[PDB]
Design a protein around this ligand. Structure first.
Ligand code: CL
Ligand code: FE
Length: 302
């Protein structure tokens, strides 16, 4: 094969869900070595796999449901924050597909924001009431992922100059994306190489292999994560910008092998954002530079 597999199970630091602060402190030196040596980070979080599996299985069942219907909670009929991303269900349109940078996007997916979990703005929580088995599991996984990613953010901050502020990740602005790949046909690429626009991403263990990362030397590898308790932490383009380009974005892609007639591939990722209204900053020449432009401006810029 052109892309070697990358074993992480038994090889990334172990971070216990009931002991997250102390274990992440102990894991800091290894996580720094990963960001330095690889360009992305990884921890093994015992039991997370089964929590994420159950959550994604309830999402698959909600995608199939004939009443209530996920389609009744498309982003265009869900109350959206005045200043914010778009939360809610993103249906697959076969006729005029959503483009990922010009390429048809072979998935249906939901964005569960911290705002939505809190029913903000009012009515945003409706999908989580229509599909309570999914909704309760999505809130659980969001909260576990948010706690993990906030502490990955502290490791990265610790690698930056003194004076580097707290990343101040926004619960309400941060989104859990839950993905059901569909209408794949003969595709071997589900997602061409990209990086997130946000501060950090946390890849939760997917149903299937195929997610790939590029190393600093341009070598593509395939983390062994399907059926594991391994999470991956991604640098987004906001943290590339905040770090004055010190930390490149954790560029990745998703490939697949042919599977049965609409076999269900599932994946979930937390995209962590700072407050849209807060001013940008960059660590330039060893100390903090405040910008006039907001994180919200950073997103619009693209
Ligand atoms: Cl991404
Ligand atoms: Fe991605």
């Amino acid at each position: 094969m052109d892309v070697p597999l990358m074993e992480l199970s038994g090889r990334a630091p172990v971070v216990r869900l009931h002991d997250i602060e102390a274990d992440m402190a102990a894991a800091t030196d290894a996580i720094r070595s990963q960001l330095t040596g690889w360009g992305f980070m990884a921890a093994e979080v015992p039991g997370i796999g089964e929590r994420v599996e159950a959550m994604m299985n309830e999402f698959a069942a909600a995608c199939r449901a004939t009443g209530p219907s996920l389609s009744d909670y498309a982003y265009d009929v869900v109350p959206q924050l005045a200043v914010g991303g778009t939360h809610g269900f993103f249906p697959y349109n076969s006729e005029i597909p959503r483009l990922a940078n010009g390429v048809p996007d072979p998935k249906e997916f939901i964005h569960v924001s911290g705002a939505m979990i809190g029913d903000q703005p009012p009515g945003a929580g409706d999908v989580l009431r229509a599909f309570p088995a999914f909704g309760t599991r999505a809130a659980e996984v969001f909260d576990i992922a948010f706690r993990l990613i906030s502490l990955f953010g502290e490791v990265v901050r610790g690698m930056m100059p003194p004076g580097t502020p707290e990343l101040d990740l926004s619960h309400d602005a941060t989104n859990l994306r839950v993905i059901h790949y569909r209408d794949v046909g003969d595709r071997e690429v589900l997602a061409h190489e990209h990086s997130g626009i946000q501060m950090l991403g946390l890849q939760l263990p997917p149903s299937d292999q195929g997610l790939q990362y590029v190393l600093h030397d341009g070598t593509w590898v395939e983390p062994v994560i399907a059926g594991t308790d391994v999470v991956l932490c991604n640098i987004g383009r906001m943290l590339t910008s905040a770090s004055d380009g010190r930390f490149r974005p954790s560029t990745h892609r998703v490939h697949t092998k042919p599977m049965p007639a609409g076999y269900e591939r599932l994946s979930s990722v937390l995209f962590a954002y700072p407050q849209h209204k807060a001013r940008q900053w960059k660590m330039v020449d060893g100390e903090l530079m405040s910008l006039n432009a907001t994180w919200g401006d950073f997103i619009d810029s693209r």
